[PDB]
Amino acid sequence: WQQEVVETIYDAVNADTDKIEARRKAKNKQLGQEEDYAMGKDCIMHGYMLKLGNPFLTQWQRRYFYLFPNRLEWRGEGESRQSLLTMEQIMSVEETQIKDRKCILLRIKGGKQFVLQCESDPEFAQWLKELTCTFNEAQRLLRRAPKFLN
């Protein structure tokens, strides 16, 4: 397949991809605030997921999200409110496969369940690695805690 792309159409396709990226980047900026709130800090992860909350939403809508060892946060593709669902709020995390739109479940103080679909299998392996670190250590938080207050 890489062959196909190489000898057939590669360079002109990548010039057109130049053009398509330029078309996208010149349009909107509200996503910038979300990413700035997410980039490179105690926030372990920074990426976009299609979101299912409780049965409030049973249909996918791409949103933006945040992942701290102490909190999880999310925004609706440019939401004004930095919506907060902390690790200290949530009590479980699971992986769900909804019609090959693969997603990560989590259950919260509040009788809440959030289902967050990061797009494709590598992006999902990445976000699931970060969550299998972050909230599973928020569950291992119990056996990691006893050292830093007394």
């Binding site: 119990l142 805690a145 006893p146 007394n150």
Partner: protein
């Protein structure tokens, strides 16, 4: 003969004992005065009441029970009642200070002060009896009175009487709802004492009681009276072949011998049935097969746990009322072929047949209706180990940073006891998982 001594510690223990005593007196026709004033119209009472009551030279009945509590606010509440003419004030020992959901005080600085008196009382009660089989210790894990004092008394009773059965009945802190915060503090220390110094222990909670009452009895504003009535009915059903007889009498020793598979695994799963209201006992045909099948349903268990998660090692089976052996045989044949019910690949069968000719009675003003026959089951499964797992997880969360521990330290007690209890519970859970796994 078949006579036992009941022990009631804490407010819950005292109220449960009162409910059991009132149930016994109403079911045996025992009048609250203590005599038999029914000289015009008799309504029963010509039976073997010597198991629980005592007969004097004048025709009076004296209860044989231990009502002890560190707080006098329960003793006076019971004393100002209408049955105050039944028992004796000497059996109700008051106290100045109490534990009130505290173990250290009630085990060292409070419970150690009233020891000789209760030992003398129980020795006198035992001397007044001829045949002794077991004891009915009523307490609670949440209540500090029902934990520290109960542990210190049972540790002495175990070393003073080894040939006698030592039962246990208390209330388990539900993982979802709870009354206090320091409940696991007392529970983690009480479980070690009840495991390494007792023979059997029965565990129940209240959330399952709430679920079953709202689901069957359909009540919107429950109360402790129904909770006590259910426990009293269960106790009466368990000790049904002692006060009366039947085709196959099942004494305490008959079932406790088989109810204990291992010295470490002695936590059966009780299930009373039918738990229904008056309107739920009129337009519903009742047989034995249906209720036996319902006894294995997770919705009717008093412990929140899915039986399908583990499997059964031993089952103790009981009945009360007009029960036909053919129905029992048919129920056994049906359940032995049920694929839903899981069991070990080694024990093909185990259960008991207790036929009781006396049907259960009713209470004027209560919620229990007139049922021809009753049924109670005592099974042993490994799916219940999750409750101990949750308790250990809680203890780890609430011990990592030593919340509310400085009080116990100031009272006087070894901090290493927490680690000892933690490792003992972990070892018990490991033993349970090793038993649960098959070949």
């Amino acid at each position: 003969m078949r006579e036992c001594i009941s022990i009631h510690v804490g407010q819950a223990g005292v109220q449960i004992g009162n409910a059991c005593w009132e149930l016994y007196c109403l079911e045996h026709g025992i009048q609250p005065d203590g005599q038999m004033p029914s000289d015009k119209t008799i309504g029963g009472g010509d039976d073997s009441f010597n198991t629980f009551f005592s007969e004097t030279g004048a025709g009076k009945h004296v209860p044989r029970a231990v009502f002890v509590d560190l707080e006098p606010t329960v003793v006076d509440e019971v004393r100002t009642g209408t049955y105050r003419q039944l028992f004796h004030p000497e059996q109700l020992i008051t106290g100045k200070e109490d534990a009130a959901n505290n173990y250290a005080r009630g085990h060292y600085t409070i419970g150690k002060e009233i020891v000789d008196l209760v030992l003398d009382r129980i020795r006198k009660l035992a001397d007044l009896c001829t045949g002794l089989q077991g004891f009915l210790i009523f307490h609670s894990f949440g209540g500090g009175t029902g934990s520290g004092f109960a542990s210190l008394l049972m540790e002495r009773l175990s070393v003073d009487y080894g040939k006698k059965s030592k039962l246990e009945f208390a209330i388990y802190p539900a993982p979802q709802v709870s009354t206090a915060v320091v409940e696991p503090y007392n529970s983690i220390l009480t479980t070690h004492t009840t495991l390494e110094h007792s023979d059997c222990a029965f565990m129940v909670d209240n959330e399952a009681i709430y679920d079953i009452c709202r689901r069957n009895l359909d009540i919107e504003r429950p109360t402790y009276t129904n909770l006590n009535r259910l426990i009293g009915q269960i106790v009466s059903s368990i000790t049904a072949s002692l006060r009366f007889d039947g085709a196959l009498n099942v004494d305490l020793t008959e079932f406790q011998t088989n109810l204990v598979p291992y010295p470490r695994i002695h936590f059966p799963l009780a299930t009373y049935a039918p738990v229904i209201s008056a309107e739920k006992a009129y337009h519903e045909q009742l047989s034995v097969a249906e209720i036996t099948n319902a006894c294995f349903e997770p919705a009717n268990q008093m412990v929140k746990c899915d039986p399908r998660h583990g499997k059964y090692m031993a089952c103790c089976m009981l009945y009360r009322g007009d029960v036909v052996p053919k129905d029992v045989n048919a129920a056994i044949a049906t359940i032995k072929t049920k694929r839903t019910i899981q069991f070990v690949d080694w024990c093909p069968t185990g259960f008991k047949v207790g036929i009781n000719y006396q049907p259960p009675t009713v209470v004027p003003g209560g919620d229990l209706a007139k049922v021809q026959r009753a049924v109670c089951m005592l099974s042993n499964t490994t799916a219940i180990a999750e409750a101990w797992a949750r308790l250990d997880h809680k203890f780890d969360l609430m011990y990592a940073k030593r919340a509310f521990v400085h009080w116990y330290v100031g009272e006087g007690m070894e901090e290493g006891e927490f680690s000892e209890a933690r490792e003992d519970l972990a070892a018990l859970e490991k033993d349970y998982e090793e038993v649960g796994v098959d070949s």
